[PDB]
Amino acid sequence: SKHLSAYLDSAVANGPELIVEDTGLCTSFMLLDNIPSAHLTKELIGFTWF
Amino acid sequence: VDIKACDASITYNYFLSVICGAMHEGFEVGNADAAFMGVPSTIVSDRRSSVAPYSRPISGLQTMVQHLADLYAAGFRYSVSDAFSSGNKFSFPTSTFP
Amino acid sequence: MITIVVIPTAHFSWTDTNFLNSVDYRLTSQPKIRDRFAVYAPGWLRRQLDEFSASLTASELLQALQTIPIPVKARCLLLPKPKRFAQWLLDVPSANIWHIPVTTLRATVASKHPSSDVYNYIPDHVPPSAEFDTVTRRVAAGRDIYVRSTKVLGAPLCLAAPAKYYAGYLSTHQLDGVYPDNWAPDNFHKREFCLTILPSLLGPRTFLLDVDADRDASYPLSVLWPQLRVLALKSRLLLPPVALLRRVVDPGLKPTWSADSDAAFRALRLSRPSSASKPTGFDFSALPVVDIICLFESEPDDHGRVAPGTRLTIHSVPTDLLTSLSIQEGVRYPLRQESGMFVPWVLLALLMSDDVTISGTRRSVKLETAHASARPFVHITVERCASARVVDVRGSPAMYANAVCLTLPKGSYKSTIIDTLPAMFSDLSILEQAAVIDSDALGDSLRPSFETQFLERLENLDPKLLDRAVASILSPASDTSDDAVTTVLDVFNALYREVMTPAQRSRLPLLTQQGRVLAFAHSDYELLSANIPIQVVRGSIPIDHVVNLLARRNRVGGTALQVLLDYCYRTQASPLAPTPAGRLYKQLFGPWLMVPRLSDPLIKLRLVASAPAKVLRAAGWTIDGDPPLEVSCLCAYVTDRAMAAALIERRLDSRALVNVGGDQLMFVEYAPPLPLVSIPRTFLLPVTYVVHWVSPQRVLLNGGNVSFTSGLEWTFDD
């Protein structure tokens, strides 16, 4: 606020950065592992498969 | 009326800084690329905007101011070599205008 | 042959063996890489640009240069004045390749006013009534050009005829300047890539290199940077430096087809196996630095998960600092110490850096390093080196070997760099703590300390006024709040002017006239008001000091006097653009950090100044032996004894005004100030140094105080 800025001729001589291209996956949401599964080794063997 | 010591009272911390800024801003109206007295235009970083800093050219006049302000802020560095005294030359800086 | 046009950055190293290194030193790591590049960028063109810089606008200059082919095959052939020039076509008749009549030639020899006729009708003759572009247009033709002036641009300029005609028509230095062009040509080779400082039409096979740093302000073509950048931007032609390392060029980061996980990319692995027995056993003026992107993270949640965190960019941290500390990429180091402060090495990285910004945008941030922020960071990981280049250090922030004063706001971490860093080595002489001057020294000198006296005066005011002042200073929106703060400022100014100035002025030799002094101050005014001939550098650190000093509780004031003093000093400081303090630190400590990387031992030096025994005895000193005494003013280090001896024959034009009291407090003064750039860049100096007798056993009794003058002479020692 109150950042009064004067118009400058050279300042506007930059042009916006229009060309931005992505080769990754067009997504914005992620699946997560919020609570990890337990590693059973003595009892309940086989109920989990990593 | 008369200033008590105008030479000793003109200084950078109050006076010259204001003048340097005004002159540098006052020269903005003009071709950014126009050498003056053999001093070419140069690129300087503008940091007025914390969100959008950048660098832009400035005319030779402004380049002169850039150095001139630097010199004034550094203060004049005199070297005394009085002959009446004996073997006592030295140098010390001061803000006193020439 | 793809071409990359290059514009040098702020402190681009020019005298480097290879221009290539200053671009990005990673390109030199592998033979398989360095063989893919040509450079061009000839010196003769460099000199021409240096001259014409003051006479052409950016648009004109770009318009003129852009058409020139890569290897300039043409030459500018200067013609001598007609009276001189005409004789050439008869000294060798076959040299009259235009076949100007003999009658006209000797008519010119006879005339009091030899006309331009000898030039007239000679094809491609350029009269002084010509313009820059006229030359450039002919340059595209590749054939040599005949000119009548030295101020020309685009092609190497050499004499057409032997020097005898131009002599008298021109003078020695002028006659000298054309010698490399007289035998100018050298070949240019068809590798995969060729860098160039010469601009060109940006296109499918020409690219603009983007380094993400400010240009060299002194470099004459930096003015072209905006126009070039925007044209490249609008067509997606910028190249980040990392792209050069890939086998095939593409503008981008994290490409699909490449993981960019290779030893070539890792800039931290700086290696120097090769050698050439060259005089630069080391060039301690060239310093490799890196820009790095680091990820910061806080404590994990109750189930071991962790927040996404934030990544910041640190600019131009010297690489040897990281290497010597065995820092490695992709390792999540702990960030916080036992007491919650930062681990020392991180602080060093911040201190010696130039700037810290958010990784993506270009917003600079001052990092906090205390208990202020919630969910504070506890882990740090360096991810990749955005850039890695060598930079020239010689005499950049500071100019004189005598001393230099750095101004920093109160609460900076100067203690860390001056104590922990040399202590982290403690094996090679870096400095003497007796020579560094803490900014608080003079304030501690008064019998009641300056802080105590200020406190004692201050309490006389009403507490509410003080309370209002402190709150206003903290609250950023509290504009001025004149009453409360101004009253305090008056007390501060009145006291400081009254007591501090004479006390400061009474320590003049202590600040400057020692061996080599490094000093700190809270404001340049502290020195200017006392007339102390020492260069002052207005530094700044990329960390929030206000919060930092808010954590220091064991002081005379209850953390409130500190902020008051901080504001007073900042108010007292002169308004000017301050520089990053890291640059000064790089100039001082940088070269030392490269010592462990060296392969061969060092060699000590000094420039002892003599002292006649007559004045010493006349001053009541008891001294054995007739030979004049000598005193070491400053020690230096090299490693190639051969060239070092070869460079020791210079006679410095700077006298020394030695002064010493009976208490053996010894002082030195150079009547012509000794500039750092005068030191050959193969040398190496300690950060601070203390003058001392080379052989204290020579003296047997200190008489009265002594002063004398002598010359200076670099010499070996054993």
GROMACS .gro file of N, CA and C in nm, chain B:
model
  294
   51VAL      N    1   2.242   3.942   0.661
   51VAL     CA    2   2.245   3.800   0.695
   51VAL      C    3   2.357   3.734   0.617
   52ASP      N    4   2.405   3.622   0.670
   52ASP     CA    5   2.505   3.542   0.601
   52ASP      C    6   2.522   3.409   0.673
   53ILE      N    7   2.535   3.301   0.595
   53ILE     CA    8   2.555   3.170   0.654
   53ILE      C    9   2.685   3.168   0.732
   54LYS      N   10   2.683   3.107   0.850
   54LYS     CA   11   2.800   3.107   0.936
   54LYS      C   12   2.920   3.043   0.866
   55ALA      N   13   2.901   2.923   0.813
   55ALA     CA   14   3.003   2.862   0.727
   55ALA      C   15   2.930   2.775   0.626
   56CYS      N   16   2.896   2.834   0.511
   56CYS     CA   17   2.821   2.761   0.410
   56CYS      C   18   2.902   2.644   0.357
   57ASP      N   19   3.033   2.665   0.339
   57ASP     CA   20   3.120   2.559   0.292
   57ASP      C   21   3.120   2.441   0.389
   58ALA      N   22   3.120   2.469   0.519
   58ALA     CA   23   3.125   2.364   0.619
   58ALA      C   24   2.989   2.306   0.652
   59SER      N   25   2.881   2.372   0.613
   59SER     CA   26   2.747   2.326   0.649
   59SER      C   27   2.679   2.247   0.538
   60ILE      N   28   2.709   2.278   0.412
   60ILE     CA   29   2.662   2.192   0.304
   60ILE      C   30   2.727   2.056   0.318
   61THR      N   31   2.646   1.951   0.311
   61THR     CA   32   2.694   1.817   0.340
   61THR      C   33   2.604   1.716   0.271
   62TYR      N   34   2.646   1.590   0.274
   62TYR     CA   35   2.573   1.489   0.199
   62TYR      C   36   2.456   1.431   0.278
   63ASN      N   37   2.474   1.410   0.408
   63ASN     CA   38   2.372   1.338   0.485
   63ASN      C   39   2.237   1.408   0.476
   64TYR      N   40   2.236   1.542   0.481
   64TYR     CA   41   2.112   1.616   0.464
   64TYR      C   42   2.098   1.678   0.325
   65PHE      N   43   2.193   1.762   0.285
   65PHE     CA   44   2.172   1.844   0.166
   65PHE      C   45   2.198   1.766   0.038
   66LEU      N   46   2.323   1.721   0.019
   66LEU     CA   47   2.363   1.672  -0.112
   66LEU      C   48   2.283   1.550  -0.154
   67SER      N   49   2.243   1.465  -0.059
   67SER     CA   50   2.162   1.350  -0.094
   67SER      C   51   2.032   1.393  -0.159
   68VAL      N   52   1.967   1.494  -0.103
   68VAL     CA   53   1.843   1.545  -0.161
   68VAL      C   54   1.869   1.597  -0.301
   69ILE      N   55   1.975   1.676  -0.318
   69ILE     CA   56   2.005   1.733  -0.448
   69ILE      C   57   2.035   1.624  -0.549
   70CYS      N   58   2.116   1.525  -0.510
   70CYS     CA   59   2.151   1.418  -0.602
   70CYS      C   60   2.026   1.343  -0.647
   71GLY      N   61   1.937   1.311  -0.552
   71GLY     CA   62   1.815   1.243  -0.590
   71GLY      C   63   1.729   1.327  -0.683
   72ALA      N   64   1.714   1.455  -0.652
   72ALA     CA   65   1.633   1.542  -0.736
   72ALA      C   66   1.691   1.552  -0.876
   73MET      N   67   1.823   1.571  -0.886
   73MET     CA   68   1.886   1.581  -1.017
   73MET      C   69   1.870   1.451  -1.094
   74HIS      N   70   1.892   1.338  -1.027
   74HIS     CA   71   1.881   1.211  -1.096
   74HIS      C   72   1.738   1.188  -1.144
   75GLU      N   73   1.640   1.219  -1.060
   75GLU     CA   74   1.501   1.210  -1.104
   75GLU      C   75   1.470   1.314  -1.210
   76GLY      N   76   1.521   1.436  -1.193
   76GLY     CA   77   1.491   1.541  -1.289
   76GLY      C   78   1.543   1.511  -1.427
   77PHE      N   79   1.647   1.428  -1.437
   77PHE     CA   80   1.701   1.391  -1.567
   77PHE      C   81   1.626   1.275  -1.630
   78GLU      N   82   1.529   1.216  -1.561
   78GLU     CA   83   1.456   1.104  -1.618
   78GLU      C   84   1.386   1.143  -1.747
   79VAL      N   85   1.339   1.267  -1.756
   79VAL     CA   86   1.275   1.316  -1.877
   79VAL      C   87   1.386   1.341  -1.979
   80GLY      N   88   1.403   1.247  -2.071
   80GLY     CA   89   1.509   1.255  -2.169
   80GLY      C   90   1.546   1.118  -2.219
   81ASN      N   91   1.613   1.117  -2.333
   81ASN     CA   92   1.650   0.991  -2.396
   81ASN      C   93   1.741   0.911  -2.305
   82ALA      N   94   1.695   0.793  -2.265
   82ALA     CA   95   1.772   0.711  -2.173
   82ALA      C   96   1.907   0.673  -2.231
   83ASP      N   97   1.919   0.672  -2.363
   83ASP     CA   98   2.044   0.639  -2.430
   83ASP      C   99   2.091   0.765  -2.502
   84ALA      N  100   2.164   0.850  -2.430
   84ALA     CA  101   2.217   0.973  -2.488
   84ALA      C  102   2.343   1.008  -2.410
   85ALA      N  103   2.458   0.978  -2.468
   85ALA     CA  104   2.584   1.008  -2.403
   85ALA      C  105   2.600   1.159  -2.387
   86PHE      N  106   2.664   1.198  -2.277
   86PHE     CA  107   2.689   1.339  -2.249
   86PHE      C  108   2.835   1.356  -2.212
   87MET      N  109   2.904   1.443  -2.286
   87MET     CA  110   3.046   1.470  -2.262
   87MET      C  111   3.127   1.341  -2.258
   88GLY      N  112   3.097   1.252  -2.351
   88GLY     CA  113   3.169   1.128  -2.362
   88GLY      C  114   3.132   1.024  -2.259
   89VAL      N  115   3.033   1.049  -2.174
   89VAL     CA  116   2.989   0.953  -2.074
   89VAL      C  117   2.869   0.879  -2.130
   90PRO      N  118   2.881   0.752  -2.165
   90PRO     CA  119   2.770   0.680  -2.227
   90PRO      C  120   2.666   0.638  -2.125
   91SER      N  121   2.548   0.605  -2.177
   91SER     CA  122   2.443   0.551  -2.093
   91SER      C  123   2.480   0.411  -2.047
   92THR      N  124   2.428   0.372  -1.931
   92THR     CA  125   2.458   0.242  -1.873
   92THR      C  126   2.332   0.182  -1.813
   93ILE      N  127   2.344   0.056  -1.772
   93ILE     CA  128   2.235  -0.020  -1.712
   93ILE      C  129   2.252  -0.017  -1.561
   94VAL      N  130   2.145   0.017  -1.491
   94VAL     CA  131   2.145   0.021  -1.346
   94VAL      C  132   2.025  -0.057  -1.295
   95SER      N  133   2.038  -0.114  -1.176
   95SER     CA  134   1.931  -0.192  -1.115
   95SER      C  135   1.836  -0.100  -1.041
   96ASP      N  136   1.707  -0.113  -1.069
   96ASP     CA  137   1.603  -0.037  -1.002
   96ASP      C  138   1.537  -0.125  -0.898
   97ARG      N  139   1.534  -0.079  -0.774
   97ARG     CA  140   1.481  -0.157  -0.663
   97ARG      C  141   1.371  -0.083  -0.589
   98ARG      N  142   1.304   0.010  -0.657
   98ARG     CA  143   1.194   0.081  -0.593
   98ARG      C  144   1.081  -0.014  -0.556
   99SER      N  145   1.055  -0.113  -0.640
   99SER     CA  146   0.951  -0.211  -0.616
   99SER      C  147   1.014  -0.337  -0.557
  100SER      N  148   0.976  -0.370  -0.434
  100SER     CA  149   1.025  -0.492  -0.373
  100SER      C  150   0.972  -0.615  -0.443
  101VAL      N  151   0.854  -0.604  -0.505
  101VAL     CA  152   0.796  -0.719  -0.572
  101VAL      C  153   0.845  -0.731  -0.716
  102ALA      N  154   0.880  -0.620  -0.781
  102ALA     CA  155   0.922  -0.621  -0.921
  102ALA      C  156   1.048  -0.538  -0.939
  103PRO      N  157   1.161  -0.585  -0.887
  103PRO     CA  158   1.288  -0.521  -0.918
  103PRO      C  159   1.334  -0.559  -1.058
  104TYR      N  160   1.421  -0.475  -1.113
  104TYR     CA  161   1.470  -0.495  -1.249
  104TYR      C  162   1.584  -0.397  -1.274
  105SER      N  163   1.631  -0.394  -1.398
  105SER     CA  164   1.737  -0.304  -1.441
  105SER      C  165   1.695  -0.235  -1.570
  106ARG      N  166   1.730  -0.108  -1.582
  106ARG     CA  167   1.694  -0.028  -1.697
  106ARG      C  168   1.808   0.067  -1.731
  107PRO      N  169   1.817   0.111  -1.856
  107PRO     CA  170   1.922   0.206  -1.893
  107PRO      C  171   1.898   0.344  -1.834
  108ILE      N  172   2.007   0.418  -1.817
  108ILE     CA  173   2.001   0.555  -1.769
  108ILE      C  174   2.098   0.639  -1.851
  109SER      N  175   2.060   0.764  -1.877
  109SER     CA  176   2.139   0.851  -1.961
  109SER      C  177   2.271   0.887  -1.894
  110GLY      N  178   2.364   0.939  -1.975
  110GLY     CA  179   2.495   0.972  -1.924
  110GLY      C  180   2.490   1.071  -1.809
  111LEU      N  181   2.400   1.169  -1.818
  111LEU     CA  182   2.383   1.264  -1.709
  111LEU      C  183   2.356   1.191  -1.578
  112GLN      N  184   2.267   1.093  -1.581
  112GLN     CA  185   2.236   1.019  -1.460
  112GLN      C  186   2.357   0.938  -1.413
  113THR      N  187   2.434   0.882  -1.506
  113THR     CA  188   2.555   0.812  -1.468
  113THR      C  189   2.650   0.904  -1.395
  114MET      N  190   2.665   1.027  -1.444
  114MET     CA  191   2.745   1.126  -1.374
  114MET      C  192   2.696   1.145  -1.232
  115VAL      N  193   2.564   1.157  -1.216
  115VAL     CA  194   2.508   1.174  -1.082
  115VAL      C  195   2.539   1.053  -0.996
  116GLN      N  196   2.525   0.933  -1.052
  116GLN     CA  197   2.554   0.812  -0.977
  116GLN      C  198   2.693   0.817  -0.917
  117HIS      N  199   2.793   0.852  -0.998
  117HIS     CA  200   2.928   0.864  -0.944
  117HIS      C  201   2.940   0.984  -0.853
  118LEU      N  202   2.879   1.097  -0.890
  118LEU     CA  203   2.894   1.218  -0.810
  118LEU      C  204   2.839   1.196  -0.670
  119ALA      N  205   2.723   1.132  -0.659
  119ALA     CA  206   2.669   1.102  -0.527
  119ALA      C  207   2.761   1.010  -0.450
  120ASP      N  208   2.818   0.910  -0.518
  120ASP     CA  209   2.912   0.821  -0.452
  120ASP      C  210   3.029   0.899  -0.394
  121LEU      N  211   3.084   0.991  -0.472
  121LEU     CA  212   3.196   1.071  -0.424
  121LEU      C  213   3.156   1.155  -0.304
  122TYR      N  214   3.041   1.223  -0.313
  122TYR     CA  215   2.998   1.308  -0.203
  122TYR      C  216   2.975   1.226  -0.077
  123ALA      N  217   2.910   1.111  -0.090
  123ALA     CA  218   2.888   1.026   0.026
  123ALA      C  219   3.021   0.981   0.086
  124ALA      N  220   3.118   0.949   0.001
  124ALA     CA  221   3.249   0.911   0.051
  124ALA      C  222   3.321   1.028   0.117
  125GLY      N  223   3.286   1.151   0.083
  125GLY     CA  224   3.351   1.266   0.141
  125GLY      C  225   3.483   1.298   0.075
  126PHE      N  226   3.517   1.426   0.068
  126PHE     CA  227   3.642   1.467   0.005
  126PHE      C  228   3.761   1.421   0.088
  127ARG      N  229   3.867   1.379   0.020
  127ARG     CA  230   3.988   1.331   0.085
  127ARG      C  231   4.101   1.427   0.050
  128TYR      N  232   4.136   1.513   0.145
  128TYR     CA  233   4.242   1.611   0.125
  128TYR      C  234   4.374   1.559   0.177
  129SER      N  235   4.482   1.619   0.128
  129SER     CA  236   4.618   1.586   0.171
  129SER      C  237   4.692   1.716   0.198
  130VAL      N  238   4.731   1.737   0.322
  130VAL     CA  239   4.796   1.860   0.363
  130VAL      C  240   4.947   1.840   0.360
  131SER      N  241   5.018   1.940   0.309
  131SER     CA  242   5.164   1.934   0.298
  131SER      C  243   5.225   2.070   0.333
  132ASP      N  244   5.182   2.127   0.446
  132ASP     CA  245   5.226   2.261   0.482
  132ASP      C  246   5.378   2.268   0.492
  133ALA      N  247   5.435   2.376   0.439
  133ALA     CA  248   5.579   2.394   0.438
  133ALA      C  249   5.630   2.464   0.562
  134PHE      N  250   5.550   2.552   0.622
  134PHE     CA  251   5.595   2.623   0.741
  134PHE      C  252   5.623   2.527   0.855
  135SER      N  253   5.536   2.428   0.874
  135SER     CA  254   5.565   2.324   0.970
  135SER      C  255   5.671   2.230   0.914
  136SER      N  256   5.720   2.140   0.999
  136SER     CA  257   5.834   2.056   0.965
  136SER      C  258   5.791   1.910   0.958
  137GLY      N  259   5.811   1.849   0.841
  137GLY     CA  260   5.791   1.706   0.820
  137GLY      C  261   5.665   1.650   0.880
  138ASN      N  262   5.549   1.702   0.839
  138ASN     CA  263   5.424   1.663   0.902
  138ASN      C  264   5.310   1.650   0.802
  139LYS      N  265   5.338   1.606   0.680
  139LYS     CA  266   5.232   1.590   0.582
  139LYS      C  267   5.146   1.469   0.616
  140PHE      N  268   5.016   1.482   0.590
  140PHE     CA  269   4.922   1.374   0.614
  140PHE      C  270   4.796   1.402   0.534
  141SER      N  271   4.703   1.307   0.539
  141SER     CA  272   4.577   1.318   0.468
  141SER      C  273   4.463   1.279   0.560
  142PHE      N  274   4.351   1.349   0.548
  142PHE     CA  275   4.233   1.314   0.624
  142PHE      C  276   4.111   1.363   0.547
  143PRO      N  277   4.001   1.288   0.551
  143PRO     CA  278   3.882   1.326   0.476
  143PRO      C  279   3.793   1.420   0.555
  144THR      N  280   3.704   1.486   0.482
  144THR     CA  281   3.606   1.574   0.544
  144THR      C  282   3.490   1.594   0.448
  145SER      N  283   3.375   1.631   0.505
  145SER     CA  284   3.258   1.664   0.425
  145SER      C  285   3.258   1.808   0.379
  146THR      N  286   3.358   1.887   0.418
  146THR     CA  287   3.362   2.027   0.380
  146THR      C  288   3.369   2.041   0.229
  147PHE      N  289   3.280   2.122   0.173
  147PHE     CA  290   3.280   2.145   0.030
  147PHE      C  291   3.408   2.218  -0.010
  148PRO      N  292   3.459   2.194  -0.131
  148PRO     CA  293   3.587   2.255  -0.170
  148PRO      C  294   3.586   2.406  -0.161
   0.00000   0.00000   0.00000
